Amino acid sequence: ERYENLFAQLNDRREGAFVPFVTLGDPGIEQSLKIIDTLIDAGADALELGVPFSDPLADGPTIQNANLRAFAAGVTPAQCFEMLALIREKHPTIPIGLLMYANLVFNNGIDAFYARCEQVGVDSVLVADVPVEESAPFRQAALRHNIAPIFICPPNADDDLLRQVASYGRGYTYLLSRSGVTGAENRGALPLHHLIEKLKEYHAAPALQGFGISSPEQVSAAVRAGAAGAISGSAIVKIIEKNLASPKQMLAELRSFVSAMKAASRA
Amino acid sequence: ERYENLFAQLNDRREGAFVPFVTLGDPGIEQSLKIIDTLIDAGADALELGVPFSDPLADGPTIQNANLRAFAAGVTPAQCFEMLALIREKHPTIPIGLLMYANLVFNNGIDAFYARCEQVGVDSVLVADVPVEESAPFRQAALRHNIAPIFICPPNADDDLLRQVASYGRGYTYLLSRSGVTGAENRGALPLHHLIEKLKEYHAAPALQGFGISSPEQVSAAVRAGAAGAISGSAIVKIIEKNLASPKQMLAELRSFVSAMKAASRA
Amino acid sequence: TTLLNPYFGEFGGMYVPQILMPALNQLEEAFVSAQKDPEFQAQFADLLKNYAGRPTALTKCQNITAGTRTTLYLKREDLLHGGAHKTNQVLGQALLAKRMGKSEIIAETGAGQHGVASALASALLGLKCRIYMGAKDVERQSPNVFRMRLMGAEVIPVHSGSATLKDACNEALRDWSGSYETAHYMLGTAAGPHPYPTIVREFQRMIGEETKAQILDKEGRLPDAVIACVGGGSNAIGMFADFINDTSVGLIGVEPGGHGIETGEHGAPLKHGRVGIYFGMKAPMMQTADGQIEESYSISAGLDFPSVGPQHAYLNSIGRADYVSITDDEALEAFKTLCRHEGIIPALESSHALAHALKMMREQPEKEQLLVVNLSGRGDKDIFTVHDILKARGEI
Amino acid sequence: TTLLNPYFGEFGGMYVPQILMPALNQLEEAFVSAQKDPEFQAQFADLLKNYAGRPTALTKCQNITAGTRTTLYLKREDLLHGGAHKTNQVLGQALLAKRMGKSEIIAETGAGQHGVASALASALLGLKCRIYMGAKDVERQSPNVFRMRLMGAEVIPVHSGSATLKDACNEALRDWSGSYETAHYMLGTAAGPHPYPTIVREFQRMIGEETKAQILDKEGRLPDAVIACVGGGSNAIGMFADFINDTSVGLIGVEPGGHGIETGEHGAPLKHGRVGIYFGMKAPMMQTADGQIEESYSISAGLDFPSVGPQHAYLNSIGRADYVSITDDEALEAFKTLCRHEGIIPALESSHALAHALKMMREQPEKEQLLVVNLSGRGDKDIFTVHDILKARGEI
């Protein structure tokens, strides 16, 4: 299982995971594939990949506009699964996670969605607008298709929710840095050592911290606090948007940024 | 008394009275005095004279605009009484009647108004918006100053009102041709022989028909029906307005029209 | 001769052209007979309750009076169908018009509220309605003109004089002088020739009758004073009438002070005019030294009328009621205060009454007093007027 | 785990980001405790009666049904303070927000009516209110935007997507995701995540409870059917709720058909959409084959929403309620007919419900039937929309 293998290796090396997020198909299919190949080559330990959704209610403006760009290119979920199949054929060991909105999972059949995830080699699915309280049919279909169901540990979590997330989640636990929606401009400030340690006590999947992580200093800080890694999306997407007219300057700047973030995860 | 003398003479001659109305001071003091001298010289048996009022609610557009013209010349009630005094000095025998709105009579004192009417030689006052039911203080002040109070016999009059008008009125009875407001465009059509004969039975002051009389044919018809005369205002005022830039063409046309109307009153 | 007294002391009367006296006498008789007819009372009550929505609420202000010893209630005529008290007596007059065999209605309006009321009642009861409106007010009140026309009324702009209410009243009276056989003149206030001041009072007096019952239920005693704006008089006499014999209850009428009494640009004839004869009545009015009728002014079109009903003139003369004035700027502050602190957007007319109550509270904040303001209408019609004022003052 | 069932059959649920579940659970507990608290019930009833003006009238149409065997009553929520039913449940939610220690309110609106209601309740009860509105609707509804701001609300235009309600809902939910500690999200319809469909129903159900008492008093029997428009669901569930167990009473919900169902430019997901997950619930919605959320369309901004509350979806599924659609042109004819023949200017939303009742009467004019239409709001806000339509058709 790719997540267990990843975290075992990083543990041996005294390292945390750096996990970039991009929207599949932003700004186009071909450049998106080049972007992801660059994130990996530049040091990404895992991937989080979004499927453009018409109404992304957990995303701030940076990722809203990434969705809009994918739509301007005609990106459909079917094309995203084609991309996912190719990415997996290129990179057999990297964990591939999807960040989904519920309607895209539900509307052609929950089971069929996770069956297609298994066909293309996806390792995990987070459904942003399905809390653990609603997750049963999603969890069951993920597990039935050898997909890890990812659950969110919010900073306002209580003990009953910690136990649920620890018991039902697989692969990694998504540790939310703060309230609000995605965005690099808003950095989380609450200390999370208490939640991180509770999750370990309950044998939860290793925690990756996400939301508002956009500097190497935040990556080292999440690792110093016990988290097994960090996710960064808006910060990476902002580089895409800033360089739309220079596809190769974009890859250059993506490479530089990822290496600097992954470096901060080392030790 | 000028009205009794007038009607006695016209009766001898087998004639009815033609009585023009104009607004005092329309279009100016000097031309208004020339206009009235022309009406008399052209055959008018009596005069009806209006004092410009800000809100003439018994007048249609033709006489509304005559009021506006007098106001554009600065015509005040005090100037109108100066004109009245001069007109009387020029024409000692013609009956001079005023058509007033109540507020101009009431607002410096009813008695003082009729006292000023007596000083300048006015023979009668009609107060357009004082029905006989409200007339007591007006009637008393008129009579106290040797002024005839004029009352209106409307075509919807009943017997109780006929008796009141006959008993309280002096000089002449104002026989209304129709409902509505003044205007030459709207000719009365109801036959009034019945009202005219009732007034004579009750010993009313002689009746002059007014409203919408604008042709010689209407004058002869009012006389053929028993009325002692006819009043015409809008028809005469329309000649004023049509000739504002040609003061002497106006007098020429006024002369021609009055003579034709007074002719129709003969026999 | 009349069935009822046409005068309130020296004020009132029937100063109309002789041709209109039969119509006034017929209307009086119809009214007198209606007031004794339980079938008419039952029909009028059914329309008031089930169509217009009476009884209206009596709202205690929760925030406006903080820090004072004033308790303030608002009688919510703004919640009547049509958005103002006008609907009460238009429904009564419309029923009277049908009792008399009339099939057309003539009315005039300045704010448009009585026009809206006349139109809605004519639509419901099957009468042909024509409405005179000062052409100036036609352009400022184009949305209310469209409302009237949507409900099937004809709206006739009046380009004459000040192009406001007085000028529309004139044209309506000229019209009626030649159509009284088929058309009822639906006068919009407690003014004009007898019997209108009496009929409008009796068809508005449920406002004060409900207030009295409501305040006795909520406070166990009568108000120390009831406050209403005065344009022609209807909403205030409607509030006052049931309290006239309750001599402890103050009656406060508020005239518009416009840009200030000292500017001459106001609508306050009761306190700053002179008795005259016009509009069919003997009443205080704004006039020149020579007795020409002067033009009034108010930010609120519904108060912009240079005379006042005769019963208010009489109640003032004897000291039973006290009359005051509120300027445009004071009315505007009270409009904003009600919006922000009670969530009620009041008509600019009613904002004059509120403004005087706020003054009574603020001037003597340790005086214990129980006040009722008649909120005669809602201010939806006024938000454009208010927006353009706040835009010209850099406030927004 | 919840105190109350979050689902109506398969529909409903709480499909929100995990971070919002505590706020939803807190709100549920607050509501459940409020419904057992006589002090809360007494305060809510006092605001409804003495501030908003309940009970509202039940009006028998006198003219519209001439020549048929249909008797038609109109439940007059247009006479509520604010001009629509929205005020009922905003006052309840505001009280709940204070019970919970919240000092700010977030809301969204398309027609502006829920925005006006949120603003007036926040002004009265002392909350800081911010309102999201589709920038398109901000320009079409600039007078209601100004009303909201006059009452102290902040109004935030949303340039996103269709620039209408859905887009404002999204932004409100994003906002709440980061301010739920201090701000209560005042949802404007009977939709969204549990507990909102239940709370909005229970804070609207006096509409049907009053109607039942009123119709039994006037006719001695229950209606054959009650008819309401359906945008998100609140006014219709409010009318329906007390009749759900009266199985002889038909329940008819009317969705907007826009330019015609066959054009795809409509707002009728209940009958012409497909079950999906969005807005925090599992409900019928307009979506592409791929599951992207589609844009809805209606002449009436208040019905322009591409989903529908889950209880309506459930009542349809089991056959307890029947749902139909009315096109722009049919709604417009019913708006004109009510104006001209009853003197009531209805909201364009409510004009959809009236239009279907007129169809039921006209299609079967010898069928004896007793119908109640919920007149959910007044149409003052719509007269400009209607004027520009009649101007483009040469009708005026």
Ligand SMILES: Cc1ncc(COP(=O)(O)O)c(/C=N/[C@H](Cc2c[nH]c3ccccc23)C(=O)O)c1O
């Ligand atoms: C909401 C509201 N409140 C108060 C008033 C003041 O009227 P009131 O003094 O009679 O209580 C008005 C007047 N609106 C006038 C009503 C009106 C019609 N004809 C009139 C003649 C004289 C004076 C007022 C009117 C309008 O529609 O414009 C009004 O619309």
Ligand SMILES: Cc1ncc(COP(=O)(O)O)c(/C=N/[C@H](Cc2c[nH]c3ccccc23)C(=O)O)c1O
């Ligand atoms: C007068 C009137 N009648 C009927 C409706 C339909 O609403 P309902 O189906 O809930 O009974 C509305 C909606 N007005 C919407 C209300 C709203 C706010 N947020 C929403 C989210 C979804 C659907 C509707 C809304 C607006 O203010 O624009 C309305 O203003």
Ligand SMILES: O=P(O)(O)OC[C@@H](O)CO
């Ligand atoms: O965009 P940000 O704020 O980095 O949040 C991470 C998110 O995009 C993927 O989970």
Ligand SMILES: O=P(O)(O)OC[C@@H](O)CO
């Ligand atoms: O204007 P006309 O219609 O002629 O009526 C007469 C009147 O002006 C004087 O009494």
Ligand code: NA
């Ligand atoms: Na006045």
Ligand code: NA
């Ligand atoms: Na909908």
